[PDB]
Amino acid sequence: GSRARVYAEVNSLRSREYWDYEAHVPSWGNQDDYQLVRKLGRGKYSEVFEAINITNNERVVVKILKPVKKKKIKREVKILENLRGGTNIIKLIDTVKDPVSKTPALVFEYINNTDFKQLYQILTDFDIRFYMYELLKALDYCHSKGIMHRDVKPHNVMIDHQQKKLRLIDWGLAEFYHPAQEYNVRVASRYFKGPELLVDYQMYDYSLDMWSLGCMLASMIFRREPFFHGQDNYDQLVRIAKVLGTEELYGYLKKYHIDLDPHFNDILGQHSRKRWENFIHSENRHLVSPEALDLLDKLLRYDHQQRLTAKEAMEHPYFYPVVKEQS
Ligand SMILES: Brc1c(Br)c(Br)c2[nH]nnc2c1Br
């Protein structure tokens, strides 16, 4: 068994209504107040548009939900309402429906995002510290609210680099944490999946998000994006093990008595744990410091229990320059 080191019982200590999303009854407003102006993208579950509220000229983002079990809509809506006002969490402005078709949509505050592929190649050392600190605020907040995001990745971290605004978006995979609950491991993008997911360990917690965070930090300070670039879920764990080491993986599996899919036997090979300094070269040296590597080493660990919490990460000396500037 395993449980979170922080906020483990927080949902059990709240009213059932807080976490019992199947019982939640959203108030669905009228989508006709919104004029769609540009398609921003599309996923399995939704289509996203930039829009204008015609009643007050507010620019927003509208996510129109594709056919799904209502349970998942209720989950995302209840999570977003529980996270209301949370630091650097995308603001849900309203839950609306087409008044005729009854197709639901979520209305979010607009962020003028800088494409991450471009942004990440121009970040300074301070920029990385700043944005990572701001992202950690969002994760600490949602964890404190009993919620795992489960899809942390660059595409889900909107950054307006001109106004220095960051928002964690795309809460459709997020769940409530309950001790001892077994969760679906089919969450997160491949490159950001924690080892626990890749070895089919279902008793995971908020610390999954801290692995994904760590992957982002590595990509930023080392300028290798994504940092662990697997070709499929099996290869993803191999890519991790080539850095963190295979004997170290087996120690993790043994501690938690994790059964390893035997297809891994033919592909993991034998790999030493690598020094993080091995990733430094002239193109990234100005982004890497002893403090950055110490932090990264404490995030990208197999053992989910031993990863820093979001709060512990925010307390790390790597962020002292940001704290100073904010004070
Ligand atoms: Br919510 C949201 C917001 Br806000 C912005 Br901006 C987006 N850009 N692409 N996809 C986006 C989503 Br989903």
mmCIF file of C-alpha atoms and ligand atoms in Angstrom:
data_model
loop_
_atom_site.group_PDB
_atom_site.id
_atom_site.type_symbol
_atom_site.label_atom_id
_atom_site.label_comp_id
_atom_site.label_asym_id
_atom_site.label_seq_id
_atom_site.Cartn_x
_atom_site.Cartn_y
_atom_site.Cartn_z
ATOM 1 C CA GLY A 1 0.000 0.000 0.000
ATOM 2 C CA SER A 2 0.819 3.669 -0.422
ATOM 3 C CA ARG A 3 -0.667 7.008 0.494
ATOM 4 C CA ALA A 4 0.108 10.656 -0.028
ATOM 5 C CA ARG A 5 2.436 12.343 2.478
ATOM 6 C CA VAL A 6 0.338 15.501 2.387
ATOM 7 C CA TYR A 7 -3.380 16.155 2.140
ATOM 8 C CA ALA A 8 -4.064 12.458 2.394
ATOM 9 C CA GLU A 9 -7.347 12.681 4.305
ATOM 10 C CA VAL A 10 -8.380 16.116 3.192
ATOM 11 C CA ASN A 11 -11.412 14.971 1.194
ATOM 12 C CA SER A 12 -12.582 12.646 3.950
ATOM 13 C CA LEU A 13 -12.506 15.623 6.317
ATOM 14 C CA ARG A 14 -14.805 17.655 4.053
ATOM 15 C CA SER A 15 -18.523 17.310 3.416
ATOM 16 C CA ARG A 16 -19.316 14.475 1.059
ATOM 17 C CA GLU A 17 -20.826 16.991 -1.364
ATOM 18 C CA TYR A 18 -17.323 18.389 -1.933
ATOM 19 C CA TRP A 19 -16.004 15.235 -3.602
ATOM 20 C CA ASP A 20 -19.177 13.384 -4.618
ATOM 21 C CA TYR A 21 -19.207 14.809 -8.104
ATOM 22 C CA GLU A 22 -21.762 12.306 -9.434
ATOM 23 C CA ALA A 23 -24.283 14.104 -7.199
ATOM 24 C CA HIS A 24 -23.301 17.560 -8.436
ATOM 25 C CA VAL A 25 -25.925 19.480 -10.413
ATOM 26 C CA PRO A 26 -24.315 22.243 -12.488
ATOM 27 C CA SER A 27 -26.223 25.404 -13.338
ATOM 28 C CA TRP A 28 -26.118 25.595 -17.140
ATOM 29 C CA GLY A 29 -26.294 29.096 -18.594
ATOM 30 C CA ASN A 30 -26.908 30.147 -22.173
ATOM 31 C CA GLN A 31 -24.159 29.676 -24.750
ATOM 32 C CA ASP A 32 -25.896 32.125 -27.087
ATOM 33 C CA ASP A 33 -24.187 34.957 -25.209
ATOM 34 C CA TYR A 34 -20.904 33.896 -26.825
ATOM 35 C CA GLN A 35 -19.704 34.558 -30.357
ATOM 36 C CA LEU A 36 -17.038 32.115 -31.541
ATOM 37 C CA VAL A 37 -14.226 33.898 -33.337
ATOM 38 C CA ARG A 38 -11.446 31.348 -33.888
ATOM 39 C CA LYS A 39 -10.899 27.645 -33.427
ATOM 40 C CA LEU A 40 -7.920 27.027 -31.169
ATOM 41 C CA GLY A 41 -7.850 23.243 -31.228
ATOM 42 C CA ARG A 42 -9.552 19.950 -30.719
ATOM 43 C CA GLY A 43 -9.213 16.906 -28.514
ATOM 44 C CA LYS A 44 -10.877 13.545 -28.052
ATOM 45 C CA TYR A 45 -13.392 15.161 -25.703
ATOM 46 C CA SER A 46 -13.803 18.753 -26.812
ATOM 47 C CA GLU A 47 -13.281 21.524 -29.275
ATOM 48 C CA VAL A 48 -11.841 24.817 -28.121
ATOM 49 C CA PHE A 49 -12.641 28.258 -29.493
ATOM 50 C CA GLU A 50 -11.660 31.813 -28.723
ATOM 51 C CA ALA A 51 -14.899 33.744 -28.256
ATOM 52 C CA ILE A 52 -16.392 37.072 -27.225
ATOM 53 C CA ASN A 53 -19.228 37.456 -24.709
ATOM 54 C CA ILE A 54 -21.527 39.696 -26.696
ATOM 55 C CA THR A 55 -23.185 41.123 -23.567
ATOM 56 C CA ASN A 56 -19.969 42.676 -22.146
ATOM 57 C CA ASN A 57 -17.274 42.279 -24.862
ATOM 58 C CA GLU A 58 -15.200 39.937 -22.662
ATOM 59 C CA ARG A 59 -12.778 37.736 -24.613
ATOM 60 C CA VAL A 60 -12.944 34.143 -23.378
ATOM 61 C CA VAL A 61 -12.166 30.577 -24.366
ATOM 62 C CA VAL A 62 -15.102 28.199 -24.926
ATOM 63 C CA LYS A 63 -14.554 24.449 -24.664
ATOM 64 C CA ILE A 64 -17.486 22.654 -26.302
ATOM 65 C CA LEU A 65 -17.818 19.145 -24.919
ATOM 66 C CA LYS A 66 -18.105 16.146 -27.235
ATOM 67 C CA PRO A 67 -20.341 13.181 -26.346
ATOM 68 C CA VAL A 68 -19.187 11.647 -23.067
ATOM 69 C CA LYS A 69 -20.663 10.057 -19.992
ATOM 70 C CA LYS A 70 -22.142 12.888 -17.965
ATOM 71 C CA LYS A 71 -20.103 11.594 -15.029
ATOM 72 C CA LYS A 72 -16.887 12.999 -16.509
ATOM 73 C CA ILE A 73 -18.487 16.372 -17.179
ATOM 74 C CA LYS A 74 -19.731 16.536 -13.600
ATOM 75 C CA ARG A 75 -16.262 15.616 -12.367
ATOM 76 C CA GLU A 76 -14.502 18.384 -14.291
ATOM 77 C CA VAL A 77 -17.155 20.964 -13.402
ATOM 78 C CA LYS A 78 -17.113 20.108 -9.702
ATOM 79 C CA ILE A 79 -13.309 20.160 -9.636
ATOM 80 C CA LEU A 80 -13.194 23.568 -11.319
ATOM 81 C CA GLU A 81 -15.761 24.963 -8.932
ATOM 82 C CA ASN A 82 -13.840 23.569 -5.954
ATOM 83 C CA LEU A 83 -10.689 25.213 -7.296
ATOM 84 C CA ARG A 84 -12.478 28.605 -7.675
ATOM 85 C CA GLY A 85 -10.011 31.431 -7.116
ATOM 86 C CA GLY A 86 -7.010 29.123 -6.791
ATOM 87 C CA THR A 87 -3.682 30.666 -7.638
ATOM 88 C CA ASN A 88 -2.748 30.241 -11.286
ATOM 89 C CA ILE A 89 -5.610 27.843 -11.959
ATOM 90 C CA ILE A 90 -7.548 28.691 -15.110
ATOM 91 C CA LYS A 91 -10.699 30.566 -14.114
ATOM 92 C CA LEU A 92 -13.965 28.891 -15.070
ATOM 93 C CA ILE A 93 -16.265 31.828 -15.871
ATOM 94 C CA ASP A 94 -19.393 29.797 -16.612
ATOM 95 C CA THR A 95 -20.915 26.449 -17.501
ATOM 96 C CA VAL A 96 -23.251 26.889 -20.478
ATOM 97 C CA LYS A 97 -25.319 24.921 -22.960
ATOM 98 C CA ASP A 98 -26.616 25.469 -26.464
ATOM 99 C CA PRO A 99 -30.247 26.136 -25.438
ATOM 100 C CA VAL A 100 -31.583 23.932 -28.250
ATOM 101 C CA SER A 101 -29.183 21.000 -28.507
ATOM 102 C CA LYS A 102 -28.268 21.122 -24.808
ATOM 103 C CA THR A 103 -24.624 20.455 -25.725
ATOM 104 C CA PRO A 104 -22.559 21.657 -22.759
ATOM 105 C CA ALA A 105 -19.557 23.941 -22.847
ATOM 106 C CA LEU A 106 -17.143 25.451 -20.366
ATOM 107 C CA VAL A 107 -16.186 29.115 -20.559
ATOM 108 C CA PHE A 108 -12.725 30.077 -19.327
ATOM 109 C CA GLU A 109 -10.804 33.278 -18.992
ATOM 110 C CA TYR A 110 -8.708 34.084 -22.030
ATOM 111 C CA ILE A 111 -4.899 33.876 -21.833
ATOM 112 C CA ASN A 112 -2.751 35.225 -24.652
ATOM 113 C CA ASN A 113 -0.440 32.221 -24.673
ATOM 114 C CA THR A 114 3.079 32.134 -26.051
ATOM 115 C CA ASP A 115 3.628 28.852 -27.918
ATOM 116 C CA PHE A 116 5.760 26.775 -25.592
ATOM 117 C CA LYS A 117 8.070 25.396 -28.264
ATOM 118 C CA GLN A 118 9.226 28.911 -29.085
ATOM 119 C CA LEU A 119 9.080 30.159 -25.492
ATOM 120 C CA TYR A 120 11.172 27.376 -24.006
ATOM 121 C CA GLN A 121 14.102 28.113 -26.269
ATOM 122 C CA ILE A 122 14.315 31.768 -25.073
ATOM 123 C CA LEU A 123 13.752 31.400 -21.312
ATOM 124 C CA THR A 124 16.399 32.800 -18.971
ATOM 125 C CA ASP A 125 17.452 31.192 -15.691
ATOM 126 C CA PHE A 126 15.244 33.567 -13.750
ATOM 127 C CA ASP A 127 12.338 32.998 -16.162
ATOM 128 C CA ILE A 128 12.445 29.256 -15.496
ATOM 129 C CA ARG A 129 12.557 29.769 -11.760
ATOM 130 C CA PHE A 130 9.661 32.199 -11.957
ATOM 131 C CA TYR A 131 7.363 30.108 -14.116
ATOM 132 C CA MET A 132 8.122 26.915 -12.231
ATOM 133 C CA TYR A 133 7.334 28.693 -8.972
ATOM 134 C CA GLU A 134 4.066 29.949 -10.385
ATOM 135 C CA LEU A 135 3.140 26.493 -11.660
ATOM 136 C CA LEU A 136 3.978 25.030 -8.249
ATOM 137 C CA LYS A 137 1.524 27.456 -6.675
ATOM 138 C CA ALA A 138 -1.232 25.959 -8.828
ATOM 139 C CA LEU A 139 -0.267 22.397 -7.961
ATOM 140 C CA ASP A 140 0.076 23.098 -4.264
ATOM 141 C CA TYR A 141 -3.349 24.679 -4.394
ATOM 142 C CA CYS A 142 -5.086 21.839 -6.202
ATOM 143 C CA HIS A 143 -3.363 19.207 -4.052
ATOM 144 C CA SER A 144 -4.478 21.097 -0.957
ATOM 145 C CA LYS A 145 -7.995 20.923 -2.399
ATOM 146 C CA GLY A 146 -7.734 17.166 -2.638
ATOM 147 C CA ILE A 147 -7.297 17.061 -6.418
ATOM 148 C CA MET A 148 -4.676 15.478 -8.671
ATOM 149 C CA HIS A 149 -4.395 17.138 -12.091
ATOM 150 C CA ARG A 150 -2.989 14.027 -13.840
ATOM 151 C CA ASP A 151 -2.115 15.789 -17.106
ATOM 152 C CA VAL A 152 0.640 18.274 -16.331
ATOM 153 C CA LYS A 153 2.588 19.075 -19.514
ATOM 154 C CA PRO A 154 3.670 22.183 -21.441
ATOM 155 C CA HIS A 155 0.523 22.224 -23.568
ATOM 156 C CA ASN A 156 -1.548 22.455 -20.359
ATOM 157 C CA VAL A 157 0.438 25.345 -18.869
ATOM 158 C CA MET A 158 -0.591 28.532 -20.608
ATOM 159 C CA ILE A 159 1.957 31.309 -20.298
ATOM 160 C CA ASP A 160 1.502 34.901 -21.415
ATOM 161 C CA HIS A 161 5.176 35.826 -21.494
ATOM 162 C CA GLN A 162 4.436 39.510 -22.059
ATOM 163 C CA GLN A 163 2.183 39.938 -18.995
ATOM 164 C CA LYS A 164 3.961 37.174 -17.032
ATOM 165 C CA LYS A 165 0.741 35.255 -16.423
ATOM 166 C CA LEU A 166 0.592 31.481 -16.025
ATOM 167 C CA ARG A 167 -2.453 29.243 -15.859
ATOM 168 C CA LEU A 168 -2.787 25.498 -15.402
ATOM 169 C CA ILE A 169 -5.533 24.356 -17.796
ATOM 170 C CA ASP A 170 -7.299 21.172 -18.961
ATOM 171 C CA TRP A 171 -8.752 19.642 -15.824
ATOM 172 C CA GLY A 172 -10.643 16.907 -17.670
ATOM 173 C CA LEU A 173 -8.359 14.159 -16.374
ATOM 174 C CA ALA A 174 -8.220 15.488 -12.831
ATOM 175 C CA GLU A 175 -9.545 13.386 -9.945
ATOM 176 C CA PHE A 176 -10.146 13.539 -6.231
ATOM 177 C CA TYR A 177 -7.569 11.786 -4.069
ATOM 178 C CA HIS A 178 -8.838 9.279 -1.518
ATOM 179 C CA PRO A 179 -6.402 7.145 0.497
ATOM 180 C CA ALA A 180 -6.006 3.577 -0.766
ATOM 181 C CA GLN A 181 -8.106 4.244 -3.869
ATOM 182 C CA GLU A 182 -6.859 2.546 -7.005
ATOM 183 C CA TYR A 183 -6.836 4.863 -10.010
ATOM 184 C CA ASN A 184 -6.713 4.342 -13.742
ATOM 185 C CA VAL A 185 -3.109 4.503 -14.965
ATOM 186 C CA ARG A 186 -4.240 5.712 -18.431
ATOM 187 C CA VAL A 187 -3.658 9.363 -17.577
ATOM 188 C CA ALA A 188 -1.062 12.005 -18.556
ATOM 189 C CA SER A 189 0.738 12.413 -21.863
ATOM 190 C CA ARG A 190 3.288 9.725 -22.602
ATOM 191 C CA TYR A 191 6.302 11.919 -22.030
ATOM 192 C CA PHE A 192 5.004 13.116 -18.641
ATOM 193 C CA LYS A 193 3.763 9.790 -17.254
ATOM 194 C CA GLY A 194 5.319 8.884 -13.941
ATOM 195 C CA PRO A 195 6.991 5.497 -13.566
ATOM 196 C CA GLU A 196 4.092 4.401 -11.393
ATOM 197 C CA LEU A 197 1.770 4.707 -14.374
ATOM 198 C CA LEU A 198 4.175 2.926 -16.699
ATOM 199 C CA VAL A 199 4.466 -0.055 -14.335
ATOM 200 C CA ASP A 200 0.696 -0.190 -13.772
ATOM 201 C CA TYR A 201 0.763 0.868 -10.102
ATOM 202 C CA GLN A 202 -2.740 2.132 -9.383
ATOM 203 C CA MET A 203 -2.347 3.403 -5.807
ATOM 204 C CA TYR A 204 -0.802 6.700 -6.859
ATOM 205 C CA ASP A 205 -1.394 10.210 -5.524
ATOM 206 C CA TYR A 206 -0.613 13.937 -6.005
ATOM 207 C CA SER A 207 3.052 12.995 -6.404
ATOM 208 C CA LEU A 208 2.283 11.920 -9.976
ATOM 209 C CA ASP A 209 1.968 15.619 -10.844
ATOM 210 C CA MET A 210 5.378 16.244 -9.281
ATOM 211 C CA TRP A 211 6.991 13.771 -11.671
ATOM 212 C CA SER A 212 5.386 15.580 -14.607
ATOM 213 C CA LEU A 213 6.555 18.889 -13.144
ATOM 214 C CA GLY A 214 10.062 17.497 -12.876
ATOM 215 C CA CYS A 215 9.981 16.477 -16.522
ATOM 216 C CA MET A 216 9.075 20.051 -17.415
ATOM 217 C CA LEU A 217 11.866 21.464 -15.258
ATOM 218 C CA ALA A 218 14.391 19.146 -16.890
ATOM 219 C CA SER A 219 13.245 20.168 -20.354
ATOM 220 C CA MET A 220 13.567 23.837 -19.505
ATOM 221 C CA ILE A 221 16.958 23.836 -17.809
ATOM 222 C CA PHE A 222 18.508 21.370 -20.253
ATOM 223 C CA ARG A 223 16.725 22.496 -23.442
ATOM 224 C CA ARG A 224 15.624 18.982 -24.365
ATOM 225 C CA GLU A 225 11.858 19.012 -24.870
ATOM 226 C CA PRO A 226 10.332 16.621 -24.058
ATOM 227 C CA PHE A 227 13.063 15.390 -21.765
ATOM 228 C CA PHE A 228 12.109 11.671 -21.850
ATOM 229 C CA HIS A 229 10.966 11.027 -25.404
ATOM 230 C CA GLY A 230 9.524 7.534 -25.508
ATOM 231 C CA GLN A 231 8.051 5.992 -28.642
ATOM 232 C CA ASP A 232 5.307 4.160 -26.671
ATOM 233 C CA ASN A 233 4.619 3.493 -22.989
ATOM 234 C CA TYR A 234 7.097 0.647 -22.785
ATOM 235 C CA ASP A 235 9.876 2.678 -24.372
ATOM 236 C CA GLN A 236 8.976 5.587 -22.109
ATOM 237 C CA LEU A 237 10.052 3.604 -19.063
ATOM 238 C CA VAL A 238 13.206 2.516 -20.864
ATOM 239 C CA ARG A 239 14.056 6.172 -21.536
ATOM 240 C CA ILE A 240 13.572 6.934 -17.858
ATOM 241 C CA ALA A 241 15.653 3.949 -16.749
ATOM 242 C CA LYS A 242 18.537 5.000 -19.004
ATOM 243 C CA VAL A 243 18.807 8.091 -16.789
ATOM 244 C CA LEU A 244 17.605 6.981 -13.328
ATOM 245 C CA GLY A 245 19.116 3.501 -13.583
ATOM 246 C CA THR A 246 17.714 -0.017 -13.785
ATOM 247 C CA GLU A 247 18.832 -1.300 -10.382
ATOM 248 C CA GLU A 248 17.147 1.753 -8.917
ATOM 249 C CA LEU A 249 13.926 0.896 -10.777
ATOM 250 C CA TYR A 250 13.969 -2.624 -9.343
ATOM 251 C CA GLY A 251 14.406 -1.298 -5.843
ATOM 252 C CA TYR A 252 11.295 0.820 -6.327
ATOM 253 C CA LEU A 253 9.318 -2.114 -7.648
ATOM 254 C CA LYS A 254 10.389 -4.275 -4.734
ATOM 255 C CA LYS A 255 9.476 -1.672 -2.110
ATOM 256 C CA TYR A 256 5.897 -1.433 -3.357
ATOM 257 C CA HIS A 257 5.664 -5.073 -4.503
ATOM 258 C CA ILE A 258 4.905 -3.954 -8.035
ATOM 259 C CA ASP A 259 4.427 -6.581 -10.708
ATOM 260 C CA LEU A 260 6.398 -5.744 -13.828
ATOM 261 C CA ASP A 261 4.900 -6.632 -17.208
ATOM 262 C CA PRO A 262 7.357 -9.199 -18.624
ATOM 263 C CA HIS A 263 7.526 -7.457 -21.985
ATOM 264 C CA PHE A 264 9.879 -5.062 -20.185
ATOM 265 C CA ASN A 265 12.422 -7.848 -19.638
ATOM 266 C CA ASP A 266 13.599 -7.745 -23.267
ATOM 267 C CA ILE A 267 13.862 -3.944 -23.559
ATOM 268 C CA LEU A 268 15.050 -2.430 -20.228
ATOM 269 C CA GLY A 269 18.660 -3.570 -20.549
ATOM 270 C CA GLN A 270 21.135 -2.602 -17.836
ATOM 271 C CA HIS A 271 21.739 1.065 -17.121
ATOM 272 C CA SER A 272 23.676 2.930 -14.480
ATOM 273 C CA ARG A 273 22.137 5.916 -12.770
ATOM 274 C CA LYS A 274 23.471 8.964 -14.591
ATOM 275 C CA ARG A 275 24.750 12.177 -13.084
ATOM 276 C CA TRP A 276 22.460 15.085 -13.877
ATOM 277 C CA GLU A 277 25.561 17.095 -14.784
ATOM 278 C CA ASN A 278 25.899 14.791 -17.821
ATOM 279 C CA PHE A 279 23.129 16.785 -19.509
ATOM 280 C CA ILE A 280 25.014 20.108 -19.311
ATOM 281 C CA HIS A 281 26.682 21.557 -22.366
ATOM 282 C CA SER A 282 27.385 24.978 -23.789
ATOM 283 C CA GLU A 283 23.815 25.519 -25.012
ATOM 284 C CA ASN A 284 22.209 25.088 -21.575
ATOM 285 C CA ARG A 285 24.954 25.837 -19.044
ATOM 286 C CA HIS A 286 23.544 29.278 -18.186
ATOM 287 C CA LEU A 287 20.257 27.662 -17.097
ATOM 288 C CA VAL A 288 21.773 25.016 -14.838
ATOM 289 C CA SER A 289 22.979 25.587 -11.288
ATOM 290 C CA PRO A 290 23.708 23.292 -8.341
ATOM 291 C CA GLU A 291 20.372 24.310 -6.866
ATOM 292 C CA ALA A 292 18.495 23.458 -10.058
ATOM 293 C CA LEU A 293 20.061 20.006 -10.156
ATOM 294 C CA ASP A 294 19.398 19.368 -6.472
ATOM 295 C CA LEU A 295 15.744 20.244 -6.976
ATOM 296 C CA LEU A 296 15.446 18.179 -10.132
ATOM 297 C CA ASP A 297 17.051 15.192 -8.466
ATOM 298 C CA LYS A 298 14.369 15.356 -5.751
ATOM 299 C CA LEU A 299 11.494 15.469 -8.282
ATOM 300 C CA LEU A 300 12.584 12.879 -10.859
ATOM 301 C CA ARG A 301 12.682 9.927 -8.484
ATOM 302 C CA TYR A 302 11.064 6.573 -9.059
ATOM 303 C CA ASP A 303 9.727 6.466 -5.525
ATOM 304 C CA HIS A 304 6.645 8.642 -5.658
ATOM 305 C CA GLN A 305 6.599 8.915 -1.844
ATOM 306 C CA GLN A 306 10.069 10.380 -1.825
ATOM 307 C CA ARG A 307 9.453 13.083 -4.425
ATOM 308 C CA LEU A 308 9.115 16.592 -3.055
ATOM 309 C CA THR A 309 5.619 17.850 -2.492
ATOM 310 C CA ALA A 310 4.692 20.999 -4.367
ATOM 311 C CA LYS A 311 5.195 22.952 -1.156
ATOM 312 C CA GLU A 312 8.590 21.371 -0.430
ATOM 313 C CA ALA A 313 9.617 22.222 -3.990
ATOM 314 C CA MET A 314 8.515 25.842 -3.523
ATOM 315 C CA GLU A 315 10.593 25.922 -0.337
ATOM 316 C CA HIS A 316 13.740 24.856 -2.166
ATOM 317 C CA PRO A 317 16.639 27.337 -2.419
ATOM 318 C CA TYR A 318 16.329 27.291 -6.234
ATOM 319 C CA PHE A 319 13.330 29.569 -5.777
ATOM 320 C CA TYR A 320 14.865 31.980 -3.265
ATOM 321 C CA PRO A 321 15.572 34.572 -6.008
ATOM 322 C CA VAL A 322 11.894 34.492 -7.018
ATOM 323 C CA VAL A 323 10.671 34.762 -3.428
ATOM 324 C CA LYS A 324 12.949 37.738 -2.919
ATOM 325 C CA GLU A 325 11.575 39.516 -5.984
ATOM 326 C CA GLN A 326 7.962 38.824 -4.953
ATOM 327 C CA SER A 327 8.672 40.170 -1.446
HETATM 328 BR BR1 LIG B 1 -8.931 26.892 -21.375
HETATM 329 C C1 LIG B 1 -7.741 27.159 -22.827
HETATM 330 C C2 LIG B 1 -7.200 28.419 -22.943
HETATM 331 BR BR2 LIG B 1 -7.672 29.723 -21.645
HETATM 332 C C3 LIG B 1 -6.355 28.718 -23.981
HETATM 333 BR BR3 LIG B 1 -5.596 30.419 -24.153
HETATM 334 C C4 LIG B 1 -6.064 27.761 -24.932
HETATM 335 N N1 LIG B 1 -5.306 27.729 -26.050
HETATM 336 N N2 LIG B 1 -5.358 26.506 -26.601
HETATM 337 N N3 LIG B 1 -6.145 25.738 -25.884
HETATM 338 C C5 LIG B 1 -6.595 26.487 -24.820
HETATM 339 C C6 LIG B 1 -7.422 26.162 -23.753
HETATM 340 BR BR4 LIG B 1 -8.051 24.420 -23.660
#
